[PDB]
Amino acid sequence: VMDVMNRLILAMDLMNRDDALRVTGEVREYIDTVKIGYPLVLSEGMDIIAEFRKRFGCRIIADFKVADIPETNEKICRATFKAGADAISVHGFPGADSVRACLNVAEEMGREVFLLTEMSHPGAEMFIQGAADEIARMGVDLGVKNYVGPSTRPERLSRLREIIGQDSFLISPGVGAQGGDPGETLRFADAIIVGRSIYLADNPAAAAAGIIESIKDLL
Amino acid sequence: MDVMNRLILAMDLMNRDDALRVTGEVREYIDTVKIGYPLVLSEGMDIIAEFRKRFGCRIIADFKVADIPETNEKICRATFKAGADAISVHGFPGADSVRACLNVAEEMGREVFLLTEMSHPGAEMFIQGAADEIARMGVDLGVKNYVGPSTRPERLSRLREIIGQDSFLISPGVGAQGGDPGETLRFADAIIVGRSIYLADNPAAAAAGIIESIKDLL
Ligand SMILES: O=c1cc(O)n([C@@H]2O[C@H](COP(=O)(O)O)[C@@H](O)[C@H]2O)c(=O)[nH]1
Ligand SMILES: O=c1cc(O)n([C@@H]2O[C@H](COP(=O)(O)O)[C@@H](O)[C@H]2O)c(=O)[nH]1
Incomplete structure (x- = not known):
């Protein structure tokens, strides 16, 4: 599995290149893994992945929550990995053929899929929660190794x-702004995803250092 | 929404030159183009403005937004800033996530299309069983535009x-995935067609042929 520094992944959802680069640079001593999603990509272009690699040499998870039919999923993954993403997130709720399409591209291109099981927001209780255990089991059957689940x-x-299982890799958002606790989340997740608590802070570096101090006994 | 010939082109070519050329070849037949992530992630969000400049068509950004409400808001803002007239949104993540998109659309004078049941086989695993409830959720939220499966x-x-008959319903899965244009238009206001047109030897003839087959429905 990927070796995530300090078990902490930055969710870089600022939408301006200058601010995103500044904040990411400020926390680079603490974090070597950055999740870049559509807020930043649709604002600044897929070349933002290239710029992050050039400037920081951080691993990049493209948090695109791929959720289309198999043929379109393949195209999305191909474009995303072409741009330099290490991994891409994929929704499980559209079913096994849609997930397999992403896995097939990731296998071909030597990259990784993260399967999103249950989401962290209140609306997840309406439909996703009831399907999540089966989505996770589906992932296991398909050979998925990386998963996303809710800190909340x-x-x-x-x-x-x-x-x-313990061998699979599990990352977890919803820490901080959405109410999840870093230490408690790390009882189960390999790494926590943190966005606003860091990137909206007066001192993002101090915010990251503070989170890390709070989980020091967990590495 | 008034869709010319009840036909929406799904422009999923991933090369700017080809996408512009093929769309140009069928322009006399359509006034509405669906642009998704295959083209946008390949050529940039600026492609939306360029379609508007070149064709004047309306643009549906088929991004199937499926994040938490806070992130959904950002995705919608970025998408509408790029000039999209409408955006597609998954209903499966729940009502708060949909409302986030509806709020931005209202602020910026755009439309949300709620994706209810999908057209591919995998939709049977989880989406299909939730689809009626997702549609009712749309009705409760005041959603006026929906997507459902030709297949x-x-x-x-x-x-x-x-x-209801007052809502607007568009439907993909026509042609390549096996759906029939005429049968689909018994229920949908417009059909979405991708590969049957854009992978055709002669895309203009392909579009002309589809329209000929539904001429009595226009
Ligand atoms: O269930 C999920 C899955 C996610 O990817 N996320 C993502 O994780 C990040 C959470 O950021 P924040 O720490 O600001 O709440 C956002 O990028 C969001 O899109 C989430 O919040 N919940
Ligand atoms: O349920 C759905 C929802 C979609 O948006 N689509 C989209 O509609 C288009 C169908 O294209 P095609 O006619 O080549 O099969 C694709 O862009 C696909 O992503 C779909 O096929 N099924």
Whole structure:
């Protein structure tokens, strides 16, 4: 599995290149893995991935939550990996053929898929929660190794860890702004994803250092 | 929304030259183009403005937004800043995520298309069983525009029943995925067609042929 420094992944959802580069540079001593999603990519272009690699040499997870039919999923993955992303996130709810399409491209291109199981926001309870255990099991059957699950529901995150096993890699958003606790989340997740608590801070470096101090005994 | 010939082109070519050329070849037949991530991630969000400059068509950004509400808001703002007239949004992530998109669309004078049931086989695993409830959620939220599957006309008909005749319904899966143009237009206001046109030896003839087959419905 990827070796994420300090078990902390920055969710870089600022939408201006200058601010995104500044904040990421400020926390680079603490974080070597950055999640870049559509807020930044649709604002600044896929070349933002290139710029991050050039400036910081951080791993990049393209958080695109791929959720189309298999043929379109393949195209999205190909374009994303062409641009230099190490990994891409994929929704499981559109079913196994859609996930397999992404896995096939990732295999061909030597990159990784992260399967999004249950989401962290309140609306996730309407439809996603009820499907999440089966989505996780589907991922295991398909050979998925990397997963995303919610910091905001420790009981659900624990169950998802059970389903995927200790050998699978699990990252977890919802820490800080959405209410999840870093230490508690790391009981189950390999790494926590943190966005606003860092990037909206007066001193993002101090914010990251503070989170790390709070989980020091967990590495 | 008034769609010319009830036909929306799904422009999923990934090369700017080809996408512009093929869209140009069929321009006399359409006034609405769906642009998705294959083209946008290959050529940039600036491609939306360039389609407007070249063709004047309306643009649906088929981004199937499927994040938390805070992130959905940002995705919608970026998309509408690029000149999209409408955006597609997954209903599966729940009502707060949909409302986030509806709020931005209202602020910027655009439309949200709610994706209810998808057209591919995998849709049967989780989406299909939630689809009627997703559509009712759309109705509760005041959603006026919906997407449902050409590949399952009985499901498309049910979706139409739920949302009523006043709502606007567009439907992909025509042609390549096996859906029939005429049957789909029994229920949908417009059909989405990608590969059957853009991979055709002669895309203009392909579009002309589809329109000929539904001429009595226009
Ligand atoms: O279930 C999920 C899955 C996500 O990818 N995310 C993403 O993780 C990040 C959370 O950032 P924040 O720490 O500001 O709440 C955002 O980029 C969001 O899109 C999430 O919040 N919940
Ligand atoms: O359920 C759905 C929803 C979609 O947006 N689509 C989209 O509609 C288009 C169908 O293209 P095609 O006619 O080549 O099969 C693609 O852009 C696809 O992403 C779909 O096929 N099924």
